[PDB]
Inverse folding.
């Protein structure tokens, strides 16, 4: 399948070169997979989600996304226009308040929630969790991400936006999950992207158009935007049967575009997420 005039990041993940604008992908499109977006919530009523999104948990007075961040990330995973895996099921877990903040204890509870809640959902092709969040190093936060991964969920986490080594941030620094840095449309490391040996992969993160609250759209930047590209890619590849939740991060690294990014510090992987779809 071909989506013309796609957001640059979608076109990038199906291309061996920057500078194109059509997204190519297998029409299975993540059908039968599920992606949890652990964030500020999801405006599930947005036409872009087509009834495939729902809130399943909140720790606050509402499950609605009063911020936009979670809706944007969910849109990059799975919206009809802005999403990588256009037929996946999206489940929102609101661990962040409407200012975008959350206590680590709540975030940990949300991760353990997903590890159990997947057993209440129909995801025959597999389960992914997208975590566009983080703070300073915490062994307890890393352990929660490790448990979620161990339980059979492909965990993708943002590297962070400090232009610093991600070893000092959580859950970015957890070795067993997929830690995602950000790139721009010219294949440069995004100016804010964290780096370091703990990164597994880069995805599009600068000037990413996606869904927003109030039934709208906007372009924003962050490792928060790169992470759902990778989460959606994992769901798509799992639906194709090419990989599993336990092996998808490694598979994405195996099949990535290699050596094509600029300003990658010595010792950080030079790997850009790529669907290897041959139309």
């Amino acid at each position: 399948a071909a989506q013309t005039n796609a957001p640059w990041g979608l076109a990038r993940i199906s291309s061996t070169s920057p500078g194109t604008s059509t997204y190519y992908y297998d029409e299975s499109a993540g059908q039968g997979s599920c992606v949890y977006v652990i964030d500020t919530g999801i405006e599930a009523s947005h036409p872009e989600f087509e009834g495939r999104a729902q809130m399943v948990k909140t720790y606050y007075y509402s499950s609605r996304d009063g911020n936009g961040h979670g809706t944007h990330c969910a849109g990059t995973v799975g919206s009809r226009t802005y999403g990588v895996a256009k037929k996946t099921q999206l489940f929102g877990v609101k661990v962040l308040d409407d200012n975008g903040s959350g206590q680590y204890s709540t975030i940990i509870a949300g991760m353990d929630f997903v590890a159990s809640d997947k057993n209440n959902r129909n995801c025959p092709k597999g389960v992914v969790a997208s975590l566009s969040l983080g703070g300073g190093y915490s062994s307890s936060v890393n352990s929660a991400a490790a448990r979620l991964q161990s339980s059979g969920v492909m965990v993708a986490v943002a590297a962070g936006n400090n232009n610093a080594d991600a070893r000092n941030y959580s859950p970015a620094s957890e070795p067993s999950v997929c830690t995602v840095g950000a790139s721009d449309r010219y294949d440069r490391r995004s100016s804010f992207s964290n780096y370091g040996s703990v990164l597994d992969i880069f995805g599009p993160g600068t000037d990413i158009l996606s869904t927003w609250i109030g039934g709208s759209t906007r372009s924003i930047s962050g490792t928060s935007m790169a992470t759902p590209h990778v989460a959606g890619l994992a769901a798509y590849l799992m639906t194709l049967g090419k990989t599993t939740a336990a092996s998808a991060c490694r598979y994405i690294a195996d099949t990535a575009n290699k050596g094509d990014l600029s300003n990658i510090p010595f010792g950080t992987v030079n790997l850009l997420a790529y669907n290897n779809y041959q139309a």
Notes: The first strand starts at residue 2 and ends at 3. The chain has one domain: 2-272.
